[PDB]
Amino acid sequence: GQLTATFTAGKDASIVMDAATADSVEIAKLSSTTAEEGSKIAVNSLTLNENHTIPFSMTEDHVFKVALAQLDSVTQEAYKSRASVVRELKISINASAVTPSGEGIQLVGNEVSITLQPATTPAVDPDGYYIVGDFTGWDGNSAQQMKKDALDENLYILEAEIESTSNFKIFPASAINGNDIDWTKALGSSVDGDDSGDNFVSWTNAGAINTALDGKIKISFDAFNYRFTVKDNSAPTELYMTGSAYNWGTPAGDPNAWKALVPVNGTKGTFWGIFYFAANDQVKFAPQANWGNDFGFVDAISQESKDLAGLSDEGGNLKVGIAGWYLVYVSVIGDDKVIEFEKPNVYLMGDTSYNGWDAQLVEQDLFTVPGTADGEFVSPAFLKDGAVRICVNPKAVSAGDWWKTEFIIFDGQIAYRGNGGDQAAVQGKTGQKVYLNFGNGTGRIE
Ligand SMILES: OC[C@H]1O[C@@H]2O[C@H]3[C@H](O)[C@@H](O)[C@@H](O[C@H]4[C@H](O)[C@@H](O)[C@@H](O[C@H]5[C@H](O)[C@@H](O)[C@@H](O[C@H]6[C@H](O)[C@@H](O)[C@@H](O[C@H]7[C@H](O)[C@@H](O)[C@@H](O[C@H]8[C@H](O)[C@@H](O)[C@@H](O[C@H]([C@H]2O)[C@@H]1O)O[C@@H]8CO)O[C@@H]7CO)O[C@@H]6CO)O[C@@H]5CO)O[C@@H]4CO)O[C@@H]3CO
Ligand SMILES: OC[C@H]1O[C@H](O[C@H]2[C@H](O)[C@@H](O)[C@@H](O[C@H]3[C@H](O)[C@@H](O)[C@@H](O[C@H]4[C@H](O)[C@@H](O)[C@@H](O)O[C@@H]4CO)O[C@@H]3CO)O[C@@H]2CO)[C@H](O)[C@@H](O)[C@@H]1O
Ligand code: NA
Numbered sequence: 001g002q003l004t005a006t007f008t009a010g011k012d013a014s015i016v017m018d019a020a021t022a023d024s025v026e027i028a029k030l031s032s033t034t035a036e037e038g039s040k041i042a043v044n045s046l047t048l049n050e051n052h053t054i055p056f057s058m059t060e061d062h063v064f065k066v067a068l069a070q071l072d073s074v075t076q077e078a079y080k081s082r083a084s085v086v087r088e089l090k091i092s093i094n095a096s097a098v099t100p101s102g103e104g105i106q107l108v109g110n111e112v113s114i115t116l117q118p119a120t121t122p123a124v125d126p127d128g129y130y131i132v133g134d135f136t137g138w139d140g141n142s143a144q145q146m147k148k149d150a151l152d153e154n155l156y157i158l159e160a161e162i163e164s165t166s167n168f169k170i171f172p173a174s175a176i177n178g179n180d181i182d183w184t185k186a187l188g189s190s191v192d193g194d195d196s197g198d199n200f201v202s203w204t205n206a207g208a209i210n211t212a213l214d215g216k217i218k219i220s221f222d223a224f225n226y227r228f229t230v231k232d233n234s235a236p237t238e239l240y241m242t243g244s245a246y247n248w249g250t251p252a253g254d255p256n257a258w259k260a261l262v263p264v265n266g267t268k269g270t271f272w273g274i275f276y277f278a279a280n281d282q283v284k285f286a287p288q289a290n291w292g293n294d295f296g297f298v299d300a301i302s303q304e305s306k307d308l309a310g311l312s313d314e315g316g317n318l319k320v321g322i323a324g325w326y327l328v329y330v331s332v333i334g335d336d337k338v339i340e341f342e343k344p345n346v347y348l349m350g351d352t353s354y355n356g357w358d359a360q361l362v363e364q365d366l367f368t369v370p371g372t373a374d375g376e377f378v379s380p381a382f383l384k385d386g387a388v389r390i391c392v393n394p395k396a397v398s399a400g401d402w403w404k405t406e407f408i409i410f411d412g413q414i415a416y417r418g419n420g421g422d423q424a425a426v427q428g429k430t431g432q433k434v435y436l437n438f439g440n441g442t443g444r445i446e
Helices: 068-078 244-249 303-309 399-405
Strands: 003-009 014-016 024-033 040-048 063-067 087-098 104-108 112-117 129-133 155-162 167-172 198-200 215-222 227-232 240-243 270-277 282-286 312-314 317-319 324-333 336-342 347-350 386-391 406-410 413-416 434-437 442-445
Touching: 003 087, 003 104, 003 112, 024 068, 024 087, 024 112, 040 068, 040 104, 063 068, 068 087, 068 112, 129 155, 240 244, 244 282, 303 324, 303 336, 386 399, 386 434, 399 406, 406 442
Parallel strands: 014 112
Antiparallel strands: 003 024, 024 063, 040 087, 087 104, 087 112, 129 167, 155 215, 198 227, 215 227, 240 282, 270 324, 282 317, 312 317, 324 336, 347 386, 386 406, 406 413, 413 442, 434 442
């Protein structure tokens, strides 16, 4: 008994905001229906790209109108971007026919498409961007320059540490001449004192953005999408893992219940360890050897990791599915967490290794991996007398920075470099090799 409707794209199908003259646009039209003559049309929902609504009106001829400014707003939200790029909008109208008794009968109709291009954004300032706010002092001399990210050239960053929350604005370099700031040239938020921490940048009578946080923060500015975030930039200085295999952390402080990870050198909130996991072991991590601000399964885990180790979520615990030795890599800055499981590749480096310093992190310099939960990684026998160096190298760390995660043996213990400088040299002789028990924390050269 089912009714159909046919919609078509309205006459304003290709909107260029720079050029747009009207304050309302026609975006769609009901062209025909199999509903009887005399029926009224009611609109149960009008959505854009599936989950966005917008105020709308419908004319006597069943043309659907919206305010251009709100269509433009909704388009920029949908795409999280003010970029001046042609954006597709898919319009879904769910309508009903209404009889003289008031009964609504559902129309099954199609979707239609239009596009809209947001207005031209400011030019990128060749000399970059500055932050000025309560925390700096509102003047040219106090303005702090944002760092242009090496990987993404649209992205500018400032890390700061502040005593209380702060209002601030972003200025292009050309707005600032000596101590003088041209206030008319601010970039900021739509609302003065916006405390969302994550919103659009405005270039038109911009208000001040509020940090919403204090302490260590990071202010990010995307000068292509024109968006900003302000994020908690503090990080744990230590990190510990407990587990089903460790009595779930009882008692507190016990090196028996809590395993320290090793800080990555000079690298905020990032840690690593080499650990044995059985199948179905569950673990969680904490910033001390005890429960509190602990975490387990999180969202930023590689598909790689998940495949390599068979990882899954088990009531918020992290569950390891495939037994084995793994290099565990963990990063925590403010709220953002990353956990990676990787091959436990330990490498001989330097003078006692293959072609010396000249081939680094190569297959020959790889330590054999034990099958047991208490065996020993063993290096390739030394090719020469020289100083022994040993490392891992996580994906996230460049090969040049192998020394950020290096260690050695002193007095039959594994001594991690961690955040410290070069370790005291330890000599080996030709045909010797290293033995590591990561379960014990002990080792030998022999
Ligand atoms: O919650 C704490 C305070 O909140 C409010 O203070 C904020 C703002 O909300 C925030 O935007 C930002 O302010 C920045 C501006 O963003 C930045 O652009 C720059 O401001 C310059 C203006 O842009 C220029 O237009 C020019 O301003 C003129 C202004 O147009 C004139 O009207 C005149 O401003 C007078 C006011 O008229 C007076 O009423 C008086 O305002 C006092 C209030 O009386 C106080 O209650 C208090 O209010 C604060 C909120 O405004 C809260 O404490 O302080 C204001 C003054 O800040 O005095 C002002 C100034 O004498 O003269 C202005 C020129 O002097 O030039 C200004 C640059 O001076 O800098 C602003 C910061 O200084 O940050 C704040 C503070 O966190
Ligand atoms: O035999 C006892 C139980 O064994 C298993 O429970 C484990 C959990 O699976 C582990 O996750 C862990 O629980 C921690 C928890 O992870 C940690 O957050 C903290 O819990 C806080 C919680 O964050 C807070 O919101 C509030 O509710 O207080 C909680 C503390 O009570 O501490 C937990 C440990 O106390 O360890 C337990 C074992 O103790 C198994 O899943 C259970 O069904 C079983 O009963
Ligand atoms: Na080598």
